[PDB]
Scaffold this motif. Structure first.
Motif, PDB file in Angstrom:
ATOM      1  N   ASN A 138       0.823  -1.199   0.000  1.00  0.00           N
ATOM      2  CA  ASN A 138       0.000   0.000   0.000  1.00  0.00           C
ATOM      3  C   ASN A 138       0.862   1.255   0.000  1.00  0.00           C
ATOM      4  OD1 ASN A 138       0.015  -1.137   3.076  1.00  0.00           O
ATOM      5  ND2 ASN A 138       0.176   1.102   3.055  1.00  0.00           N
ATOM      6  N   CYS A 170      -4.994   9.224  -1.119  1.00  0.00           N
ATOM      7  CA  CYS A 170      -5.032  10.008  -2.351  1.00  0.00           C
ATOM      8  C   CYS A 170      -6.274  10.886  -2.413  1.00  0.00           C
ATOM      9  CB  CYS A 170      -4.984   9.086  -3.572  1.00  0.00           C
ATOM     10  SG  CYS A 170      -3.557   7.979  -3.608  1.00  0.00           S
ATOM     11  N   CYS A 199      -1.028  11.650  -4.388  1.00  0.00           N
ATOM     12  CA  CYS A 199      -1.241  10.578  -5.359  1.00  0.00           C
ATOM     13  C   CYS A 199      -2.671  10.520  -5.897  1.00  0.00           C
ATOM     14  CB  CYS A 199      -0.885   9.235  -4.726  1.00  0.00           C
ATOM     15  SG  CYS A 199      -1.796   8.908  -3.191  1.00  0.00           S
ATOM     16  N   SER A 229      -5.738   7.694  -6.705  1.00  0.00           N
ATOM     17  CA  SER A 229      -6.225   6.335  -6.488  1.00  0.00           C
ATOM     18  C   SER A 229      -7.677   6.355  -6.060  1.00  0.00           C
ATOM     19  CB  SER A 229      -5.394   5.612  -5.431  1.00  0.00           C
ATOM     20  OG  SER A 229      -6.067   4.449  -4.983  1.00  0.00           O
ATOM     21  N   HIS A 246      -9.205   3.141  -1.016  1.00  0.00           N
ATOM     22  CA  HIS A 246      -8.617   3.580   0.247  1.00  0.00           C
ATOM     23  C   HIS A 246      -8.789   2.560   1.371  1.00  0.00           C
ATOM     24  CE1 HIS A 246      -8.261   7.394  -1.784  1.00  0.00           C
ATOM     25  NE2 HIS A 246      -9.571   7.477  -1.928  1.00  0.00           N
ATOM     26  N   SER A 258      -3.982   4.326   0.753  1.00  0.00           N
ATOM     27  CA  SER A 258      -4.552   4.031  -0.556  1.00  0.00           C
ATOM     28  C   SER A 258      -3.827   2.877  -1.242  1.00  0.00           C
ATOM     29  CB  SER A 258      -4.515   5.271  -1.453  1.00  0.00           C
ATOM     30  OG  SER A 258      -5.367   6.291  -0.964  1.00  0.00           O
ATOM     31  N   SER A 289      -2.760   1.335  -4.997  1.00  0.00           N
ATOM     32  CA  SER A 289      -2.588   1.669  -6.405  1.00  0.00           C
ATOM     33  C   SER A 289      -2.265   0.394  -7.178  1.00  0.00           C
ATOM     34  CB  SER A 289      -1.486   2.713  -6.587  1.00  0.00           C
ATOM     35  OG  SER A 289      -1.480   3.215  -7.910  1.00  0.00           O
ATOM     36  N   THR A 290      -3.288  -0.215  -7.767  1.00  0.00           N
ATOM     37  CA  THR A 290      -3.134  -1.566  -8.284  1.00  0.00           C
ATOM     38  C   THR A 290      -4.215  -1.953  -9.290  1.00  0.00           C
ATOM     39  OG1 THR A 290      -2.947  -3.908  -7.630  1.00  0.00           O
ATOM     40  CG2 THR A 290      -4.469  -2.514  -6.367  1.00  0.00           C
ATOM     41  N   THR A 291      -3.912  -2.953 -10.113  1.00  0.00           N
ATOM     42  CA  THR A 291      -4.901  -3.516 -11.020  1.00  0.00           C
ATOM     43  C   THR A 291      -5.222  -4.954 -10.622  1.00  0.00           C
ATOM     44  OG1 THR A 291      -3.108  -4.060 -12.555  1.00  0.00           O
ATOM     45  CG2 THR A 291      -4.387  -2.066 -13.007  1.00  0.00           C
TER      46      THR A 291
END
Ligand SMILES: CC(=O)N[C@H]1[C@H]([C@H](O)[C@H](O)CO)O[C@@](O)(C(=O)O)C[C@@H]1O
Ligand SMILES: *[C@@H]1O[C@H](CO)[C@@H](O)[C@H](O)[C@H]1NC(C)=O
Ligand SMILES: *[C@@H]1O[C@H](CO)[C@@H](O)[C@H](O)[C@H]1NC(C)=O
Lengths: 319, 172
Positions: free
Chosen positions: A39, A44, A271, A273, A276, A281, A283-285
């Motif tokens: 994380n 963000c 950032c 995103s 949360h 936050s 930041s990923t797929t």
């Protein structure tokens, strides 16, 4: 009768281990991690609208405690509520605390609409030393402490506000509990006190409770807070013979409530995103995450596993 | 895998093959060579990247939910809130575990299958001019220069050209 042609496949020196139905360690050429386990150390501020409570939790911000002035008019997708928030006003409790807190957070905005309540012969705007606002005795700026006459008299109150607007209204009111039997009578003549708030299809009756509690901010008295929702075409009646902590108006309720609250100490950064957690936050797929069950927005699903590798290539058999 | 090609009658992979998933290795009078097969490679890649995209697809767009962390116990209502979330997590963890095992089982069978399809394709090209040696290799019973080899790899090999020579070498 001598040429030879061979059909084959690639390989690398060292592949990645994955699981199948049968085997928990199959080496394949390439693989992809599906569990997000990292994380950001920050929240963000975009694309979701975050509002920092800072010193105020969302209850205090709704009540209008000292220090919560910035939260006025605030609109949020996610209300960020700090663990180190502090009571800065008169000692209180809310019988259905989590329920009120939920309603405020889900609603998504602090839009207060001031209103006139012509009470009586009463002293209005009562204050306290537990709720100091820069040197001076003060109070919840959304509440109005009603407390009797110079001439020793608070008759029966009984005021009506009819909602003919196009939105539902949220009224927050309270009931004051004195410490002895000298008390009330010189804050509130009559004994016992009592408040009755009602709509066309509802009601609420509270008898105050006298007794001496520990001293909090130099007081042993308490206020219990309540709320009433007034739909368009309905109204509300404030009935009192003492101990009412009157409202100064109403909060506007959105027809559709899409917001929520996240309790965390994580700072708000720069950032971008849409997911949360209380740890920060994401930041990923990746489709899954093991960081926290407490997750808000557009997030991977929370799972227990620290890792789940998807094969993206064939079995690796080098040489 | 199901077809017994990869980690099967093909003993191992080729680290030398870096521009393809599958390919051809040959030996003839004028030398040796390794070349990638694009069709088989792309077919495997398409099916795997196809998985990946169906995987990363999913919203899960959730805002107001329930409380999930508690200072002190309160009893009945809190028990339920915790039980609901715990039940949810177990079910999704199971889903995640099973999904990956199913996908991986399938990915391995797919790549094994594509290897076997390539072998079978070449087998059929060669007709009676060659024999399976058993290790994913064909012995070709006629002179096959670099252009002949390439004709095999790009699908233009005409078995009737060499059939008389091959039949004679095979059976006498
Ligand atoms: C309206 C009013 O006069 N409130 C007074 C209160 C209340 O009477 C008690 O706190 C009830 O518990 O007492 C004070 O000492 C205080 O808290 O600062 C002075 C304050 O002026
Ligand atoms: C006052 O109370 C009376 C009955 O006690 C009721 O008829 C009336 O509607 C009330 N008016 C207001 C303004 O609350
Ligand atoms: C999540 O998984 C990582 C490994 O991928 C692990 O280091 C971390 O402790 C896990 N977090 C948990 C279990 O909360």
């Amino acid at each position: 009768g001598n040429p030879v042609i061979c059909m084959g496949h690639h390989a690398v020196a060292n592949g990645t281990m994955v699981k199948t139905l049968a085997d928990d360690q199959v080496e394949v050429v390439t693989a992809q991690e599906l569990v997000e386990s990292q994380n950001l150390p920050e929240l963000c501020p975009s694309p979701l609208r975050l509002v920092d409570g800072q010193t105020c939790d969302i209850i205090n911000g709704a009540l209008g405690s000292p220090g919560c002035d910035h939260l006025n008019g605030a609109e949020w997708d996610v209300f960020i509520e700090r663990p180190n928030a502090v009571d800065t006003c008169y000692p209180f409790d809310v019988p259905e605390y989590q329920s009120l807190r939920s309603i405020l957070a889900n609603n998504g905005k602090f839009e207060f609409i001031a209103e006139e309540f012509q009470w009586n012969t009463v002293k209005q705007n009562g204050k306290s030393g537990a709720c100091k606002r820069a040197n001076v005795n003060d109070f919840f700026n959304r509440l109005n402490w009603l407390v009797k006459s110079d001439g020793n008299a608070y008759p029966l109150q009984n005021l009506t506000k009819i909602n003919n607007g196009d939105y539902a209204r949220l009224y927050i009111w309270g009931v004051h509990h004195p410490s002895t039997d000298t008390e009330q009578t010189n804050l509130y003549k009559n004994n016992p006190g009592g408040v009755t708030v009602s709509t066309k299809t509802s009601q609420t009756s509270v008898v105050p409770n006298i007794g001496s509690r520990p001293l909090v901010r130099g007081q042993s008295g308490r206020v219990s807070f309540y709320w009433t929702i007034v739909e368009p075409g309905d109204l509300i009646v404030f009935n009192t013979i003492g101990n009412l902590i009157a409202p100064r108006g109403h909060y506007k309720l959105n027809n559709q409530k899409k917001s929520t609250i996240l309790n965390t100490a994580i700072p708000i950064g720069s950032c971008v995103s849409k997911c949360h957690t209380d740890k920060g936050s994401l930041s990923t797929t990746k489709p899954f995450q093991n960081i926290s069950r407490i997750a808000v927005g557009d997030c991977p699903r929370y799972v227990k596993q620290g890792s789940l590798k998807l094969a993206t290539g064939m079995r690796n058999i080098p040489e | 895998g199901l077809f017994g090609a990869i980690a099967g009658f093909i003993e191992n992979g080729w680290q030398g093959l870096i521009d393809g998933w599958y390919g051809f290795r040959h030996q003839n009078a004028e030398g040796t060579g390794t070349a990638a097969d694009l069709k088989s490679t792309q077919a495997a890649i398409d099916q795997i990247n196809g998985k990946l995209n169906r995987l990363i697809e999913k919203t899960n767009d959730k805002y107001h939910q329930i409380e999930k962390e508690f200072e002190q116990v309160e009893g009945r209502i809190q028990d339920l809130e915790k039980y609901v979330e715990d039940t949810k997590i177990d079910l999704w963890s199971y889903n995640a575990e099973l999904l990956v095992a199913l996908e991986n089982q399938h990915t391995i069978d797919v790549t094994d299958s594509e290897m076997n399809k390539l072998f079978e394709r070449v087998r059929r090209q060669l007709r009676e001019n060659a024999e399976d040696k058993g290790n994913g290799c064909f012995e070709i019973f006629h002179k096959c220069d670099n252009n002949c080899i390439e004709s095999i790899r790009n699908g233009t090999y005409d078995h009737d050209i060499y059939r008389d020579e091959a039949i004679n070498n095979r059976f006498q």
